């Protein structure tokens, strides 16, 4: 059934599973037209498909051409997401295919279930967790590949860099969701925290800076402070 805080450790067991987040599939800017009407302009999007145990991210770039001449784009985007996730599962070798797919938004359940009819033993589940995967496009290297794409493209990344050499998957996922929540809540301040110190760099082959164990503790504390700070600003507390 649904995935929540009671069964949170299930994310890090040895059953292959993927999170699917469709927030950034259909992305638009909204603008006035010459006649004073309003029009949307789509920009490139992405499906965020993540293995929370290993950090493997299958980021399918959604190029604006897929919307050309299509109607009801917000509805179509769910079906396109399901269409893309199902061919990724079909393409994966049998021993790599997930046993569960957890969608971050309940509107993805029926599209994904219908596209995965050929896989009756893959459980399609919602979650009660509020996960900040919409902020993936605040990770500079992910945003850059999406916006530079000129055609549909599948891009592979490990969203944990090399952290699993030193920490468990549970801790890596907790660090990831804290970083993404902070970038979602105050992007400018989060990036300031992550880069403020020029002597800590992002390796060419990484997404995040090369912090020591002690520096990650400091960074995580500053991210928690940011989130609390913004909550106080928001609710006047």
């Amino acid at each position: 059934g649904a995935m929540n805080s009671s069964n949170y450790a299930e994310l890090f067991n040895n059953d292959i599973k993927l999170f699917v987040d469709d927030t950034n599939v259909y992305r638009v800017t909204v603008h006035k037209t010459f006649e004073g009407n309003v029009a949307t302009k789509a920009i490139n999007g992405c499906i965020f498909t993540l293995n929370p145990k290993t950090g493997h991210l299958f980021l399918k770039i959604i190029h604006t051409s897929v919307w050309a001449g299509q109607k009801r784009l917000s509805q179509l985007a769910k079906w396109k997401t399901a269409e893309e996730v199902s061919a990724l599962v079909r393409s994966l070798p049998k021993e790599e295919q997930p046993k569960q797919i957890i969608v971050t938004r309940k509107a993805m359940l029926d599209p994904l279930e219908v596209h995965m009819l050929d896989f009756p033993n893959i459980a399609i589940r919602p979650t009660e967790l509020r996960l900040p995967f919409s902020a993936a496009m605040s990770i500079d290297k992910l945003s850059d590949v999406v916006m530079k794409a000129t055609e549909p493209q599948m891009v592979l990344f490990n969203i944990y860099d090399d952290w699993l050499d030193r920490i468990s998957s549970y801790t890596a996922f907790s660090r990831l969701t804290l970083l993404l929540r902070a970038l979602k809540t105050n992007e400018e301040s989060a990036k300031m925290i992550l880069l403020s110190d020029p002597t800590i760099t992002i390796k060419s082959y990484h997404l995040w800076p090369s912090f020591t164990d002690e520096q990650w503790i400091t960074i995580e504390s500053q991210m928690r402070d940011l989130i609390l700070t913004e909550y106080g600003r928001k609710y006047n507390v």
Partner: protein, 300 residues
């Protein structure tokens, strides 16, 4: 006009014959039902006074044989049986008619209700949904499960309605996932009408039989089937115009006949609100929408 005699009535029981019903007292001199209109299927149904558990009954057509009811004190129910000796049967009925021990099927002449509820229902199709080939009549009760219910347990005692499942490979062509899920026309017209039922008359017959079993026995799987068959049509963008017009007539008389006090359990809010107000066919069911809004405005 034909006759279903009763050997006797040893236990107090409410007897239904189609949409009519009457109460028989324990050991009352009741010997059956006369003047049953030829040309339709019929259903004779029972609810025991001392145990309202198991509504049960028999679908039959007097054109196919001579049928009578006899109480079985071992199995504790009124059983339908066929009398093969025609002269014996006529003589029994005549005596009971002469002694005026039969109720008359109380049909008003202006009244087309039963025809309107059974227009497409044929005995031969009932006997394929309810499988007991040694009898010409079909037993149904409140607790019988459907084949689809059993898939989700005695297969001999099941209702073999046609399985409808909107999230199944039968309903969804590979490569047409969104199309077929949002517009069930493929599933309705190719899989169900052209493929399984062969024509809309057989589809409507099963729909009508499902409703009648839901209403007369409180059979829950029959209610599920009735709503699924409605939903499949209403959720299709492409439906022959004659089918929509006929569906409106079918549903109007079903809603008209439903007991007002059973609406909470016999009507699915989601299906009806979707069919009348959101579906492709939301504007094609004018008569049904009008009776639903005037009779059950709470459901909506």
């Amino acid at each position: 006009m034909n006759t279903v005699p009763f050997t006797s009535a040893p236990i107090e029981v409410t007897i239904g014959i189609d949409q009519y019903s009457f109460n028989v007292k324990e050991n009352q001199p009741f010997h059956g039902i006369k003047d049953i209109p030829i040309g339709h299927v019929h259903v004779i149904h029972f609810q025991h006074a001392d145990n309202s558990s198991m509504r049960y009954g028999y679908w039959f057509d007097c054109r196919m044989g001579n049928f009578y009811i006899q109480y079985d004190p071992k199995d504790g129910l009124y059983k339908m049986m066929e009398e093969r000796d025609g002269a014996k049967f006529e003589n029994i009925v005549h005596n009971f008619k002469e002694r005026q021990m039969m109720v008359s099927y109380p049909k008003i002449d202006e009244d087309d209700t039963w025809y309107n509820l059974t227009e497409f229902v044929q005995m031969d199709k009932i006997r394929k949904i309810v499988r007991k080939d040694e009898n010409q009549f079909s037993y149904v009760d409140s607790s019988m499960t459907t084949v689809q219910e059993n898939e989700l347990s005695d297969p001999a005692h099941s209702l073999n309605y046609t399985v409808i499942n909107f999230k199944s490979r039968e309903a969804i062509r590979p490569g047409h996932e969104m199309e077929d899920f949002l517009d069930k026309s493929y599933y309705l017209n190719t899989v169900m009408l052209q493929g399984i039922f062969k024509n809309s008359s057989n589809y409507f017959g099963e729909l009508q039989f499902a409703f009648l079993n839901a209403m007369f026995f409180g059979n829950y799987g029959s209610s599920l089937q009735w709503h699924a068959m409605i939903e499949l049509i209403c959720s299709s963008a492409t439906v022959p115009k004659h089918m929509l017009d006929k569906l409106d007539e079918i549903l109007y008389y079903q809603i008209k006949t439903l007991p007002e006090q059973y609406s909470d359990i016999l009507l699915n809010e989601r299906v009806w609100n979707i069919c009348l107000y959101s579906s492709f066919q939301k504007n094609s069911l004018h008569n049904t929408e009008k009776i639903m809004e005037n009779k059950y405005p709470e459901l909506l």
